[PDB]
Write a protein that binds this ligand. Structure first.
Ligand SMILES: Nc1ccc(C(=O)O)c(S)c1
Ligand SMILES: [Zn+2]
Ligand SMILES: [Zn+2]
Length: 260
């Protein structure tokens, strides 16, 4: 389950398909009028994501938007390659646009000093908090969830099967992690951003959460459960509350560790 590893794709609910690697989520939201891809995985992973989309019966040229959670190599490293293969427009939070274009994270990032660069993408555009991305019948909402990065976005939509619908959340990372030289306690904007994000995420309408690191919401345990129980195994309307709680715990543990 490495970040670049092959992973046979699978449908989670309705027109929501997992097309990522063994270790990094990517989702295709499909329609007869064209598709939206969420995240690219790693640079090597782009070849996995591309093959996975085709394996689910879709054409790369029909992917019209690529949505970015955040601009680190594990989630975004494959975006540039996928953008070239698809012709899609890449959408991201305002403060991560430059990072996606250059593939270099800025000094505001708590991990700055310890991050690896990744390939810069063409056709990157900003979206605002609350903004709707529409493609034919698809409607995906952007939710600003900064803190791990300034431009982090958590993306939400509804998928349906014969009129039975579920709220799906592609949850950005909410993790307080840094270079050795960084003190969160010295950076009130980052702390406040993280805390606002925990609050936003624990309030989302959230039947099915797909975390950018899939194990954050136990994707592989759920998939194994789904073999007998069906796709209700992915459904858990407390999952966003739980992702937020774990984010809060990681930050509180970190701030305690920093006390003089
Ligand atoms: N070192 C870390 C930890 C956590 C994440 C994350 O996405 O939560 C990343 S990219 C890097
Ligand atoms: Zn990250
Ligand atoms: Zn990550």
């Amino acid at each position: 389950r490495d970040w670049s590893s092959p992973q046979q794709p699978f449908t989670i609910y309705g027109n929501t398909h997992y097309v990522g690697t063994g270790g990094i989520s990517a989702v295709l939201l499909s329609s007869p009028q064209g598709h939206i891809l969420v995240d690219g995985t790693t640079e090597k992973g782009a070849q996995v994501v591309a093959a996975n989309i085709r394996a689910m019966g879709f054409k790369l040229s029909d992917v019209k938007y690529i949505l970015s959670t955040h601009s680190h190599e594990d989630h975004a490293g494959g975006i540039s390659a996928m953008q070239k293969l698809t012709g899609a427009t890449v959408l991201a939070g305002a403060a991560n646009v430059d990072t996606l274009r250059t593939g270099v994270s800025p000094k505001s990032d708590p991990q700055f000093g310890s991050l690896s660069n990744f390939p810069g993408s063409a056709k990157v555009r900003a979206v605002a908090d609350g903004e709707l991305v529409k493609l034919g019948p698809l409607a995906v909402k952007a939710h600003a969830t900064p803190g791990h990065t300034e431009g982090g976005i958590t993306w939400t939509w509804q998928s349906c099967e014969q009129g039975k619908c579920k709220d799906v959340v592609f949850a950005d990372s909410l993790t307080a992690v840094s270079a050795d030289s960084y003190r969160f306690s010295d950076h009130p904007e980052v702390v406040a951003s993280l805390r606002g994000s925990f609050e936003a995420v624990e309030k989302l309408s959230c039947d099915i959460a797909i975390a950018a690191h899939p194990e954050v919401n136990d994707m592989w345990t759920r998939q194994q459960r789904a073999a007998k129980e069906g796709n209700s195994a992915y459904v858990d309307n407390g999952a966003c509350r739980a992702i937020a709680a774990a984010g809060r715990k990681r930050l509180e543990t970190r701030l305690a560790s920093e006390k003089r």
